[PDB]
RNA sequence: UUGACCUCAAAUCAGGUAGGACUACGCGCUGAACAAUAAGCGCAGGAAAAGAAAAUAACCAUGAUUCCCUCAGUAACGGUGAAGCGGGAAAAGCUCAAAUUUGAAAUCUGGCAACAUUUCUUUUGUUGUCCGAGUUGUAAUUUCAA
RNA sequence: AUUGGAUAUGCCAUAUAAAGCGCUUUCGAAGAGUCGAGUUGUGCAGCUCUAAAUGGGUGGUUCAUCUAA
């Protein structure tokens, strides 16, 4: 049938060639983070991007993430819906890995975290757009497979200076909030109206 | 006695028991042979005995290796 | 591992000597076959002109000259090389022609049979 | 210059500490003139010369 | 071009409703826009991230608590973790080194005093 | 032509026909030596574009070696020792099983009148073309040595004192 | 400078697919018959699990593109048979 | 390799419907039905897909051979005695001297010396002391 | 849109169970489930000391008791260990299916134009003509 | 030096003694005859082509030209 | 006894090719033409065959001879020989009657010829040895003959052969052509066979 | 019965060829302790290897390989460490497979026989003839620059 | 003496031949257990799976360039 047992959400997950060990390990970081995401091999086709809706569609996937390296040095970041819907196009820098030293962060695995927006992602549409889709993204819905019942960790998303903040907190009986580890510099580089096509609707 | 004469390279080097000469190598067809033993190569090296045919061939080079008689 | 350069005059003349040997097998002709004006590829190079390998089809066709005949009196061929523009083109034409004009062929010995 | 291969030619390594001798490496081996004479020396006969 | 109105179509059709509960959605928007103007500073925009992480978890506490769901893990669990274990201990030791660098620091410092 | 047919045939490696011959041929092929001479190339097509021509001084030798450096670089080092007195020209692939992959090694015949008045094979009798295989000069060794125009594929460690410095 | 438009060189022309080259892969792809996993997507396709049959031939093939090029070229196997059978 | 294949089938790990799929190769569609005994033979010695293999089902299987007499009361404290026993039994089973007079100028084993021994000069200490302020 | 829902033979599904602790711990919503009781001594016993058919000895995380695999189970996996197709019903031997050649193609394959080789008397030939004239006027032959 | 080279120091028979090494000697010109007549062989090259009305190089030169008046 | 290996290894192939499933493509060369119309399959053909290396030259040094004294003829009618030749000529649609030899040696090389023959509109036949088309062309093997065009006095004779194979080869197999050749057993094999299957799928499944 | 072919053997069968040495430079493989290193193994030449773009670049574009200078201790990677451009040395381009010669296997090795030829009675061919190789494909033609 | 590439000249030449350039109301084949995907080792190799035909490779912001086995 078309689905059984339908989660609202589920994520589909690609990385391109030429990634370097950094970008894999962070791909390979948030794969664990978000369990309602099924990872796929590389895509050949840097350039024909427009087949991922017909990935999504065969893996019953509503959220395209790409994880593109250009020049082994540049990594960027799609996030798309699926049908239709908005194209986000992110630029990442500043990369932090799980095997850091320094964050000590541990949850559990597929834990249902709690979303923590900062209010400056209220003010502009498209930064209302974008605030939606990573909500409806990072969230875990109800009923996701391998997730865990009990609230352990929080994502926290800021902007600052048009840059978008990403860091993940584990909280500790008493907040006392500890570091995860998933610790990048985001930065929105353009909006697509469509997946993977349409016009331009936000430009940086 | 443990050496005997080696047919090959003349040296008592002929091992009895084991039927194999400690300098040469013999029944090898291959010379032993190591680089870390450069003094031991200088020892028994081109040019350490008659050499006798390649002086033949460094003696006709010159004329272009001809043959037949002059005039 | 240390490199020497106590040959580098035993090296120049020995090229000079080479030269000198290639004008002794061929006499009226240039020890040195004669190679197109191309402009480097880059911002930094893109006003400056060098030379190039050959002269592509279309400057050999334009000059007069066919592709095979090129050869033959000493006009190397760039098969890869194409014009993306007039300017090219037409300062790699007269290269040619001038070539042309100051050249000497000396005409070959035909065999012809008895009959036709 | 000298050869770069003059002087390391023998086989001397130092006798030890302890036997009442330079600690210098000699020649081992035997039945010869050479075997127990120092090498490897800008000091010794027949070694490699100071910063060749 | 930062079309406003073809943002807001598009984010009003892909809106989740008001309606559905903190739990189904665990997403929290604080009320409080709080602003960080050091950006280069970024000690002091740490303690702006974790006052907003804590007003965000005492807010979703309060929402969940009506929820009867269990916000606190029980000391039983022992389910798979996104940290792996031996990746602990692996941190442990690196703790221990840096705790143990100040425990010197320290006590070098008493005795330069002491002598 | 014929050899475009085989060409095609010859890329469908597991349909009906394909994987009825190859393990026919893979069971004869083991009832064989490990090196045997092969009366004619089993691919006609593959062997022809490699350089084969069939005429006298072109020979094929048929070889397995077991999977588990590369299996056709093995191919071509085993044959041309077993038949010393000729050139390994090139190789190719005939067969598999789950133990064994099976070559065909083309070699030629530099003391042939045929080959040495050939203008085209001229070439492997001159001998700097004396065991090929042996110092990775042919098809599989340039590979394997990464021989190759692109980015993908003893200036760095010399000191280069000049007279004037 | 005046930009001039080029012809198109013969090695450009690679990939272009010939009307000999299309009769010859055609009666080979009929003679030869299909590869195990072929057999199992045709199968599929017969059976109406397109999902399936997509999701089995990227894994075999290791692609997205190629398993829908061998989709394609198998679903019209099926379709010309059915035509003829 | 049968084990490893029965595990993934009962631990669901492996999809049964994805194991179906991958069990369509080029060796299923090579059938034995009917083949004599001498191609047979050689067939499955050769011709036999190895398929990858995980310590689970080793130990899986090594607990299926555990007889239940493999290690009896007998065999575990005898056996364990006469291994304990025969260790017992295998386990049952420097000279200072000083550079003067014959033994100057040395090489190797001096006369009269047996066993580990230490070579002493009077020149070493100088190095003695010093190395003891150091 | 697509739903966002699962089919029936995903790759990702819940329930790992592993190597035969007892991981009765919780369920979703942070419930404790209740823990099976131990199966009796004498039950245990008889297992382990007799092999079921089948025995891969993995326990499910939820309870337990091993998991066994059933008749059907046995037969998919002698299939596959045996290396023949995991379907009892499915001919590997289907007939010949002419999908192209049924039907007969009136046109030459070719489109290129005749040469005028094939029209006049061969040029080989009159070459070879011409050699043996040479030849026979010069007394060779 | 070489037990090689030592084999013939001590050797009675003559060294194959070559005297080719004449540096400084230019190539003699063989292909045109009117170019064999009219060129000397003390002059280089690049002299002999500029003498003759010939060019050596069809190029650029890449150095500086001489310049004797 | 004891066999020699490449005895041993000869009639094994042969029993091996016999148990296992043949292909409907490779099973198709199993069934050959019949012994009569060969008979007059190849009487038509050696009305035709290439002239042997000798007669021509007989043929132009007779001509060579006119031109040194002093001094236009007829299109040479034979068969058509040689495998890309032969399959030219079938796409050419200039075949009128292709005879494939049963027994070429890397049976691919044949294995689309009568899929080819059978597309283009042509008639064929598989007939038995490479041998015996070999001999009417002067070699020791051709994998494929074909006829394009024959006089005006054979035009009716080659008219009969064809019917014949169209009615005892094409009209006959047919259906015996699409179908998997193999799996035949002796007279005791089945039994031997089924006791062995019966006793493997007892316990001996392991 | 007689004979075609396929495969496989045999011969102190006719004529050939391989091995070992040297190993400075060259090409592969293998490889340590402290370095695409030493040692070990395989294989050549007077040079070897590389080589006529599944190459760069983002320009007004360049145009096989090799080497030198430079780029440059630069970018990148985290101390290591390039390459494109640029200046120069030398320059040279090409051969196949995939096409029906089909109005003609036009191709080739060997034997025998004459005839020449020679660094040479030592070398190298030619012409004739016969047996063979070859149609499961040897020549001419074409190699994308077309 | 032994040779090299030219020049002059004699004899022979199988030209019913061969080629360049230019024109097209006619055609134009292009290398597979290879590329690639997955995984395990040190671009390369093993293992498992295994292709395409304006296709495929490599770059860059649709374009450029190239045409492997
Ligand atoms: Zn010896």
């Given at each position: ?8 959400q589920?994520?589909?997950?690609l990385?391109?060639?030429?990634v ?7 791909l390979?970081?948030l794969?664990?983070?978000?369990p ?5 091999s590389?895509?050949?086709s840097?350039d024909?991007?427009?087949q991922?809706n017909?990935?999504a569609?065969?893996?019953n996937?509503?959220?395209?993430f ?8 540049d ?17 990442v ?8 030293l ?6 559990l ?11 400056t992602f ?7 757009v974008?605030?939606e ?19 352990d ?5 800021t902007?600052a ?26 930065t929105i580089?353009?909006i697509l109206?469509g997946?993977?096509g ?7 | ?11 008592r080097?002929?091992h009895?028991q ?9 029944p090898?067809?291959?010379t ?14 081109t ?5 006798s045919?390649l ?7 010159k004329?272009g ?6 005039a | 591992?240390?490199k ?7 090296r120049?003349?020995?090229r000079?000597?080479?030269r000198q040997?290639?004008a ?11 190679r197109?004006?191309?402009?480097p590829?880059t911002?930094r ?16 066709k334009?000059?007069?000259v066919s592709?095979?005949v ?12 194409r014009?993306?523009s ?21 005409p ?9 | ?17 302890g ?6 490496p000699?020649v081992?081996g ?10 490897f020396?800008?000091?010794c006969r ?7 | 071009?930062?079309?406003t109105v073809?943002l ?14 903190f739990?189904?959605?665990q ?14 500073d970024?000690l ?13 978890v ?7 608590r009506?929820?009867?769901?269990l916000?606190s ?6 389910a798979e ?13 690196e703790?221990?080194?840096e ?16 002598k | 032509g014929?050899?475009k ?8 490696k ?5 994987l ?7 069971w ?10 092969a009366?004619?190339?089993s691919?006609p ?13 072109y ?5 397995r070696?077991?999977r ?6 093995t191919?071509?080092e085993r ?5 010393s007195?000729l050139?390994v020209?090139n ?7 789950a ?7 083309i070699?030629?015949?530099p003391?042939?009148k ?9 070439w ?18 340039k590979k394997?040595?990464?021989?190759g ?6 200036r ?10 | ?18 009307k000999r ?7 080979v792809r009929?003679?030869a018959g299909?590869?195990?996993y072929?057999?199992?997507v045709?199968?599929?396709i017969?059976?109406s ?12 093939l290791?692609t997205?593109?190629?398993?829908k ?13 059915r035509?003829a059978? | ?9 009962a631990?669901?790990?492996?999809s ?9 190769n ?6 034995k ?5 001498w191609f ?10 190895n398929?990858p ?5 080793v ?19 005898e056996?364990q005695?006469?291994?304990?026993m025969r ?5 049952q089973?420097?000279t200072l ?9 040395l ?10 021994y230490?070579?002493?000069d ?13 | 849109?697509?739903?966002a829902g699962?089919?029936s ?6 329930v ?7 991981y009765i ?6 419930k ?8 009796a001594?004498?039950?245990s016993?008889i ?15 939820m ?12 037969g ?9 197709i ?10 010949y299916d ?8 009136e046109?030459?394959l ?5 040469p ?10 009159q070459k070879?003509?011409?050699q ?5 006027r010069?007394?060779?032959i | ?8 120091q001590?050797?009675?028979?003559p060294?194959?003694?070559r005297?080719?090494?004449?540096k400084?000697?230019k190539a003699?010109?063989?292909?045109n005859?009117?170019?064999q ?11 002999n ?5 010939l ?5 650029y ?7 004797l008046? | 006894?004891k066999?020699?290996?490449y005895?041993?290894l000869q ?6 090719n016999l148990?296992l499933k ?6 198709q ?15 038509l ?10 007669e ?8 060579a ?11 040479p ?5 040689g ?14 009657l292709?005879?494939?030899?049963s027994?070429?040696?890397?049976i ?5 010829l009568?899929?080819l ?5 042509v ?7 490479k ?7 002067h ?5 494929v003959?074909?006829?394009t065009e024959?006089?005006e006095?054979?035009?009716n ?5 064809v ?5 005892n ?8 052509r699409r ?28």
């Open positions: 049938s078309a689905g059984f047992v339908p989660i609202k589920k994520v589909l997950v990385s391109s060639r030429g370097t060990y950094r970008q894999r390990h962070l390979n970081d794969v664990s983070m978000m309602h995401s099924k990872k796929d590389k895509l050949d840097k024909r991007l427009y991922l017909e990935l569609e065969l893996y996937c509503n959220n395209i790409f994880f593109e390296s250009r020049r082994r040095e990594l960027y970041l799609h996030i798309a819906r699926a049908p239709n819907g908005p194209t986000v196009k992110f630029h820098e500043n990369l932090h890995t799980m095997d850091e320094n964050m000590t962060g541990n949850a695995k597929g834990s249902r975290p709690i979303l923590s927006f900062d209010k209220d003010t502009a549409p498209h930064l209302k974008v605030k889709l990573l909500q409806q993204t990072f969230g875990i819905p109800k009923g996701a497979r391998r997730s865990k019942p009990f609230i960790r929080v994502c926290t998303l902007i200076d048009g840059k978008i903040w990403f860091r993940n907190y584990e909280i500790r009986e008493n907040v006392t909030l500890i570091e995860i580890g998933p610790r990048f510099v985001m580089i353009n109206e997946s993977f349409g016009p331009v609707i936000y430009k940086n | 006695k443990s050496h005997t004469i080696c047919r090959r390279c003349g040296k080097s002929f009895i084991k039927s194999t000469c400690a300098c040469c190598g013999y090898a067809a291959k032993r042979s190591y680089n870390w033993g450069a003094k031991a190569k200088r020892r028994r090296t040019g350490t005995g008659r050499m045919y002086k033949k061939v460094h003696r006709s080079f004329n290796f001809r043959s037949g008689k002059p | 591992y240390v020497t350069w106590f040959n580098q005059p035993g120049k003349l020995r000079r000597q080479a040997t290639k002794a097998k061929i006499a009226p002709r240039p020890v040195e076959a004669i197109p004006a191309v402009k590829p911002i190079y893109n006003m400056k002109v060098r030379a190039g390998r050959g002269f592509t089809l279309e400057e050999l334009a000059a007069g592709r095979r090129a050869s033959t009196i000493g006009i190397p061929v760039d098969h890869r090389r014009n993306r007039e300017e090219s083109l037409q300062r790699n034409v007269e290269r040619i022609k001038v070539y042309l004009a100051h050249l000497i062929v000396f070959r010995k035909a065999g012809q049979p008895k009959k036709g | 210059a000298v050869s770069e291969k003059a002087g390391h030619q023998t086989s001397a390594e130092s006798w030890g500490t036997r009442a001798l330079a600690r210098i000699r081992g035997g039945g010869t003139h050479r075997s127990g004479q120092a090498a020396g800008n000091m027949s070694g490699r010369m100071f910063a060749p | 071009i930062n079309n073809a807001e179509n598009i984010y009003e059709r892909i809106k989740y409703p008001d309606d559905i509960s739990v189904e959605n997403a929290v928007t604080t009320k409080e826009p709080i602003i960080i103007e050091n950006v280069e970024d002091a925009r740490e303690l702006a991230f974790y006052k907003q992480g804590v007003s965000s005492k807010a979703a506490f309060a929402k969940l009506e929820a009867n769901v916000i893990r029980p000391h039983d669990y022992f973790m996104l940290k792996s274990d031996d990746h602990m201990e692996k941190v442990r030791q703790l221990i080194k705790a143990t660098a100040k425990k010197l620091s320290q006590q070098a410092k008493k005795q330069r005093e002491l | 014929a050899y047919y085989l060409e095609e045939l010859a890329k469908k597991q349909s009906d026909v394909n009825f011959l190859s393990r026919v041929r893979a004869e092929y083991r009832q064989m030596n490990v090196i045997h001479r009366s004619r190339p691919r097509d593959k062997a022809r574009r490699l350089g084969y021509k069939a005429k006298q001084g020979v094929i030798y048929r070889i070696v077991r588990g450096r590369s299996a056709r670089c191919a071509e044959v041309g020792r077993y038949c007195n050139r020209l190789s190719y692939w005939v067969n598999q099983d133990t064994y992959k099976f070559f065909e090694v070699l030629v015949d003391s042939h045929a080959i040495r008045r050939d203008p085209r094979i001229n492997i009798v001159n001998p700097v073309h004396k065991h090929r295989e042996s110092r990775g000069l042919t098809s599989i060794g394997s040595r990464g021989i125009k692109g980015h993908r594929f003893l760095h460690n010399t000191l280069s004192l000049r007279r004037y410095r | 400078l005046t930009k001039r438009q080029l012809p198109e060189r013969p090695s450009r022309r690679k990939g272009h697919l010939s080259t299309a009769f010859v892969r055609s009666i009929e003679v299909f590869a195990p072929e057999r199992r045709m199968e599929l017969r059976n699990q397109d999902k399936r049959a997509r999701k089995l031939a990227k894994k075999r290791g997205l593109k190629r398993a090029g061998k989709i394609e070229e198998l679903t019209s196997v099926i379709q010309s048979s035509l059978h | 390799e049968a084990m490893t294949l029965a595990q993934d089938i631990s669901r790990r492996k049964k419907a994805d194991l179906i799929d991958e069990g369509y080029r060796w299923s569609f090579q059938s039905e009917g083949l004599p005994d047979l033979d050689e067939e499955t010695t050769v011709n036999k897909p398929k293999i995980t310590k689970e089902a130990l899986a299987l090594r607990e299926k051979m555990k007889a239940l007499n493999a290690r009896p009361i007998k065999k575990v404290l056996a005695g006469r291994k304990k260790t017992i039994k295998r386990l089973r420097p001297v000083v550079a003067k007079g014959p033994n100057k100028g090489k190797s084993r001096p006369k009269g010396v047996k066993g580990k230490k070579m002493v009077s020149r070493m200490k100088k190095d003695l002391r010093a190395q003891k302020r150091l | 849109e697509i739903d699962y089919s033979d995903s790759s990702t599904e819940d790992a169970p592993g190597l035969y602790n007892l711990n919780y369920d979703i919503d942070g404790k489930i209740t823990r099976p009781a131990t199966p001594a004498l039950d016993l297992a382990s000391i007799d092999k079921d058919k089948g025995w891969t000895g993995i326990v499910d995380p309870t337990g008791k091993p998991v066994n695999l059933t008749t059907e189970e046995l998919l996996l002698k299939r596959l260990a045996q290396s023949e995991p379907d009892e019903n499915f001919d590997p031997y289907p007939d002419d999908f192209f050649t049924n039907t007969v193609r046109t030459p070719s489109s290129a134009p005749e005028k080789r094939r029209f006049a008397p061969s040029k080989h030939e070879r003509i011409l043996l004239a040479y030849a026979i010069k007394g060779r | 030096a070489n037990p090689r080279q030592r084999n013939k001590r050797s009675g028979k060294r194959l003694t005297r080719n090494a004449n400084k000697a003699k010109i063989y292909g005859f009117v170019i007549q009219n060129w000397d062989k003390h002059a280089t090259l690049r002299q082509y500029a003498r003759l009305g060019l050596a190089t069809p190029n030169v890449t150095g500086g030209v001489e310049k008046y | 006894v066999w020699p290996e005895i041993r009639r094994r192939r042969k029993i091996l148990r043949v292909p409907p493509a490779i099973a060369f199993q069934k050959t033409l019949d012994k009569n119309t060969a008979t007059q399959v190849f009487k053909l050696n009305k035709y065959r290439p002239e042997t290396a000798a021509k030259k007989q043929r132009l040094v007779a001509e001879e006119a031109v040194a004294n002093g001094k236009v003829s007829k299109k009618y034979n068969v058509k020989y495998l890309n030749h032969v399959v030219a000529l079938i796409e050419a649609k200039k075949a009128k292709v005879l494939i030899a027994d070429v040696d890397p691919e090389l044949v294995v689309f009568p899929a023959c059978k597309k283009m509109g008639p064929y036949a598989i007939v038995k040895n041998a015996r088309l070999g001999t009417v062309i070699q020791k093997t051709a994998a003959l074909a006829v024959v006089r006095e054979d035009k004779e080659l008219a009969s052969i019917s014949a194979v169209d009615a080869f094409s009209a006959k197999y047919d259906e015996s179908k998997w050749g193999g799996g035949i057993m002796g007279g005791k094999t089945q039994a031997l066979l089924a006791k062995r299957a019966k006793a493997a799928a007892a316990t001996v499944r392991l």
